[PDB]
Design an enzyme around this catalytic site. Sequence first.
Site: not given
Ligand code: NAD
Lengths: 334, 330, 330, 330
Positions: C12, C33, C119, C149, C176, C208, C313
């Site tokens: 995201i 990050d 997010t 999403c 999904h 979900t 998503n």
């Molecule tokens: N990918 C999807 O389809 C989707 C869709 C909608 C919402 N989301 C939501 O978005 C959020 C992230 O999802 P994602 O798919 O990007 O996961 P992801 O694992 O791809 O991204 C998480 C990132 O956060 C970083 N991280 C972990 N701890 C951290 C810290 N404390 N400080 C800074 N960075 C840190 C990790 O290194 C990683 O790069 C979640 O809440 C998820 O539910 C995901």
Amino acid sequence: MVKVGINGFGRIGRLVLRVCMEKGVRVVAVNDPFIDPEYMVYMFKYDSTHGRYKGTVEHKNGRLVVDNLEINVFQCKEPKEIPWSSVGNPYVVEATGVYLSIEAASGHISSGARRVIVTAPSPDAPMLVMGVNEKDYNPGSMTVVSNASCTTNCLAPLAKVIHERFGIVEGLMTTVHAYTATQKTVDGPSKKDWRGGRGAHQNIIPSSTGAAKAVGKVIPELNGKLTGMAFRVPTPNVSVVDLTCRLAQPASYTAIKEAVKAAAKGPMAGILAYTEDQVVSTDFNGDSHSSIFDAKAGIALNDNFVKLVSWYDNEYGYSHRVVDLLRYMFSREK
Amino acid sequence: TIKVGINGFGRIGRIVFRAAQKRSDIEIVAINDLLDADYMAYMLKYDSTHGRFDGTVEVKDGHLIVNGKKIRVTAERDPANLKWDEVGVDVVAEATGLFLTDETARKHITAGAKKVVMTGPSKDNTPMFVKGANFDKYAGQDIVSNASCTTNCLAPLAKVINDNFGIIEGLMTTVHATTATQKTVDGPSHKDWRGGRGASQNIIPSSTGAAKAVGKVLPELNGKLTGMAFRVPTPNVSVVDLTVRLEKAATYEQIKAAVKAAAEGEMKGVLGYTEDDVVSTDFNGEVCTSVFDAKAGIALNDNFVKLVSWYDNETGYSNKVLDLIAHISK
Amino acid sequence: TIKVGINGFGRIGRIVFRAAQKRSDIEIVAINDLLDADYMAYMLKYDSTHGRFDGTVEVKDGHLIVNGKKIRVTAERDPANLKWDEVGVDVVAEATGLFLTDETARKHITAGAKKVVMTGPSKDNTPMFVKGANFDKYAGQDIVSNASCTTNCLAPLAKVINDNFGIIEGLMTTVHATTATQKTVDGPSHKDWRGGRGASQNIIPSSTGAAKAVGKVLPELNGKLTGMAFRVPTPNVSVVDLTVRLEKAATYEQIKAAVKAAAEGEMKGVLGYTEDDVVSTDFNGEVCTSVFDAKAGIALNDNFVKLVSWYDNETGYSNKVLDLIAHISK
Amino acid sequence: TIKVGINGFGRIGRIVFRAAQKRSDIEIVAINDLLDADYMAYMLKYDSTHGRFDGTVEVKDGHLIVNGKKIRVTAERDPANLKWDEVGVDVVAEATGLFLTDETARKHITAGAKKVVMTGPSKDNTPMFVKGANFDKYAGQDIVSNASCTTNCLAPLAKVINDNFGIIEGLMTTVHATTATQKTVDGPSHKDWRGGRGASQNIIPSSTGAAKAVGKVLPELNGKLTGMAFRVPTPNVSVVDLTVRLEKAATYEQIKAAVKAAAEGEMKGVLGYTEDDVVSTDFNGEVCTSVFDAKAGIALNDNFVKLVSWYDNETGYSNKVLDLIAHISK
Ligand SMILES: NC(=O)c1ccc[n+]([C@@H]2O[C@H](COP(=O)([O-])OP(=O)(O)OC[C@H]3O[C@@H](n4cnc5c(N)ncnc54)[C@H](O)[C@@H]3O)[C@@H](O)[C@H]2O)c1
Ligand SMILES: NC(=O)c1ccc[n+]([C@@H]2O[C@H](COP(=O)([O-])OP(=O)(O)OC[C@H]3O[C@@H](n4cnc5c(N)ncnc54)[C@H](O)[C@@H]3O)[C@@H](O)[C@H]2O)c1
Ligand SMILES: NC(=O)c1ccc[n+]([C@@H]2O[C@H](COP(=O)([O-])OP(=O)(O)OC[C@H]3O[C@@H](n4cnc5c(N)ncnc54)[C@H](O)[C@@H]3O)[C@@H](O)[C@H]2O)c1
Ligand SMILES: NC(=O)c1ccc[n+]([C@@H]2O[C@H](COP(=O)([O-])OP(=O)(O)OC[C@H]3O[C@@H](n4cnc5c(N)ncnc54)[C@H](O)[C@@H]3O)[C@@H](O)[C@H]2O)c1
């Protein structure tokens, strides 16, 4: 002012059309007796691997219309029956995999094709690999040519660079290769290649190639000095060659890297590329190069015994080369 | 013993074959496809989904020797040419996908077989039979269909739900494994454009007559159910997702109890029941045609509920084809 | 322009970053990050799902330079230590999945940022906003959630169907794509056993909260929808399968016309409409959060229908995070 | 009976556990991971790759009961706290991937264990042992490594080739199944950037010391081999592609004969030999650590050849971990 006809609207045929659109090469007709004009609109507009066609695709009066350009659609089984004459006697891209020999492909010449490019290895048609031996093309005697295999287009430019700078004494190649339309979704019938019938998405599948031997045809000094094989794996596009060779002259891995870089920056620009990034296969999905040398994936045991790694988009990179070759051939008309 | 010829040594043909080896009432005496005996041996011996064949297979004089027994191999494209009588075949498992009308399937009887079980939904009025639903309605007919894999999953579940609570109406989705009809890379599928797209790359919406068909094996449910499918990048095992409106109010615990009772009762071996944290690979090799997933389902209220039931589309269905063969030979 | 900081440069985080470059109203000035600048550059430049970054990325000295623009890169595990104000950040896109309550997300505000968009769905009483559903209910709050999403897909559709025909009750399934929380092979997922199982091998049932969360953004639908998910072996793009009971009778043609009108009208850019023979990869890169698939849906009758809607998503959600960033700072 | 504790009930820990049930010389008496017993039970019971557990598993008083045998369950992050002597453990299978130096592995001995087998190549000078190569070189050391899955495939093949024809030099590629260290979608792997890229989408180059390590278990081959890997979207089973230059000229048929003689002789149970048209899934569950694929290999000439050998990276290796445990206890 080259005009092109495409026989077989498959992976290669559709992406050859895409590359033609991108380069302003006029495609005047597509023949495929298994896909009607409306279905052609669908297959070209949507692509699982390369994304939606970026432009417009419509059918109008039995024609395929791409970015407002009207393309005649034919529905003929036999090359000699396709009305190439009715669309201005174009060069024909033979992309069915069915008409491979000079004799079979020459059917297009009868019906008005000026030249034919077979998008595969041929038992007898001259192989031409852009960046390697395209100057071998003799318009006075060659109406049917082969653009070789995707793997040969990856291996040959690299082989040329390495052989010229260091001398390849002998080489054995593996290509770890994306699955293709000849494979099966679940274990099914492949009478002529039993392994190739096994479920494409479940398996690593040992497979035969003649690409390494074919390099000895387009680079005659390498004749008899290379062979190899393939593994088919559960990816939809992009493959990689893994070339293990003995060099005549001692060559540090830095020397090797500098030779590839120079070729890539100079005489093989657009054909051979060079990277030091931490790349994976999807990094070359949609890449126009024949061969992208992966500097960090390779390994040397000593100055004479090295494993080299080069990537290739077997679908879209190869289609770029089909188009490059027909444009080169057209430039050679007397 | 019931002598079976298999026409079409494909996914169903070969898995029917394997399942027959563990039955004493049924023996496969002949196999037809478009392939040499040595290739048939290879296709039997090794299987990407179900592993190596348990036992011995060799080719001898152009025929198969499987666990000691000789199986005739032929390669006739036309079923009428099959000379099933020469090997004394009782019932043909018609598993090519090509002969799903009375007229086409009857070529096997012309060729000397006594009866035919189509391993798919009939394209005409050829009667369909689903174990746990209407096997006992079989009336001596010489050609029958075992319905689809999805109907075999849906019907048993639907019958239990309806018998207990009354299905007012239901809509079904099956999230379904990739099959042999699909394509590795975007290719031609002129009857089903979506079905031509790279099987392993895509979620692919697909049409199914399975929910309607439940109406044919369980007439009380006629017109009460319809649905569709998504094809997804798995090689085997599928799942039914059934959304029903119930006449009689039933707690989810009551739905669970009804399904469990039928599983241990009148539908033992057809309908299964689980409360474990299962996923699709946990049913690879499953013989039950409908395995109720208790924890995966969800009710909005006592009259509106989403039920989930797993099935091995290859193994479950293949076992039931044999069950149907044994039943019609009684 | 609105100055934005990203916390968590994951799927995201990174896809938000890409979609921001296309926008004139929003500029990303900082990212946080647990990553080195060079690695962040690598992760941005190359993407398995979405291809190469359209633009320039450099690490000079230094110093993430994207499209000629300097981006501050920090590696603070704790959001309180971020010093957002030091680079003039208005809004923080909180994309770690770790800070989904006011308590946690407010650390950005104490670190110098004005507002926070989570997010993902909030784990407390943090208000959620879904574009096309309830953006206009935003009331100057400093911390908001863009929901999930799946909610972003279901809500806009639900609203159109409810407004036009009245949703009595509905049950949802999302088929999904696999995500970052899953495992390549059977591994530990103690809070979600099924979700630990090999992602590429399985259809994985999953709980979900997306259908219930529709009742939050559209209060008129509280307690009227629930559902569940099946996680399947695709890298991106998901689909909503909504089974609804309608108050007012509606033909499928009237359903289509209503969705198309909203797609061309008040929900343009949010709700999409297609009649093509689409599959999941056809929406890889899709900005609309809910694309209605006309051909895929099916009606049992004028009051009981199954509706199908697609969403990327990753991409759809990421674009709407930015739309919410824009909206809250109007 | 040798009493063993497993530390790390992951892929190797769980497949080791299953391989041990079939042995008379070894009993698993204790397992440690970071999980509750009920979760541990679930992970044993169901396997995406190898099917459901063949036997009974139950949880009582916070411990496992497997086929009527009580197994101690603990959840200690630190091996020092494991109190192995309280369950009478002779040997610990160290399968977390975390403890691959003497200093770290020794904590098990501190905790009361007698000896340790690392289920991975040692990161220090801890001696490595590969069955078929150098089990006979073991000298009563209290901490040992069974090397890697790849070395276990390469070493036994390389020995046969060297003993018969003399390896001048060799370069190896292993086309390797996806493992637990990888990611479902593009994610963080600052150690190995390629390794963070979505496992199911990519061919992923990977560095490996497996070829070099052959020189450790067969010192006659020191400095003569190296190689690399490609990770591919399969869940299990890998293959060695060994390109070797030979001192003594040999036809491909003479190579086949030499490998076959060893497979039937000195290397039996370690090195296998096939001439069938096999693919990866044909070796899922394979106990031999190296199965020579006669039809896949190719010779350029009598002195330059490409050799192909398969291994189930989970099952073969796990079985030889148990073999090493038995061997060091003799
Ligand atoms: N990918 C999807 O389809 C989707 C869709 C909608 C919402 N989301 C939501 O978005 C959020 C992230 O999802 P994602 O798919 O990007 O996961 P992801 O694992 O791809 O991204 C998480 C990132 O956060 C970083 N991280 C972990 N701890 C951290 C810290 N404390 N400080 C800074 N960075 C840190 C990790 O290194 C990683 O790069 C979640 O809440 C998820 O539910 C995901
Ligand atoms: N896919 C690749 O990675 C790749 C790369 C390089 C070269 N090639 C070669 O290009 C050729 C085509 O490969 P592809 O992947 O596009 O296969 P494909 O199966 O995707 O396409 C083949 C097409 O030819 C059509 N066709 C069959 N018979 C025909 C006839 N009688 N007249 C007109 N059209 C006919 C089919 O309808 C189909 O659309 C083959 O020779 C192949 O070996 C393939
Ligand atoms: N695979 C499943 O999950 C499944 C489940 C239930 C029912 N079915 C049904 O079973 C039938 C076959 O399914 P499948 O998955 O085994 O397909 P398949 O492609 O694996 O098998 C078809 C086999 O028939 C052979 N064949 C083709 N033409 C023939 C001919 N004229 N004579 C003899 N053999 C011929 C092919 O070589 C192939 O081996 C279809 O009706 C299908 O709908 C499939
Ligand atoms: N998977 C293979 O093909 C394979 C083959 C040969 C060797 N190996 C090696 O075996 C080792 C384990 O590999 P794997 O594939 O089983 O990995 P895995 O991720 O499946 O297993 C690791 C397990 O250890 C547990 N764990 C983590 N920290 C722990 C701790 N502090 N104390 C106790 N348990 C802890 C995890 O929960 C997990 O269950 C690695 O050294 C690996 O390189 C793997």
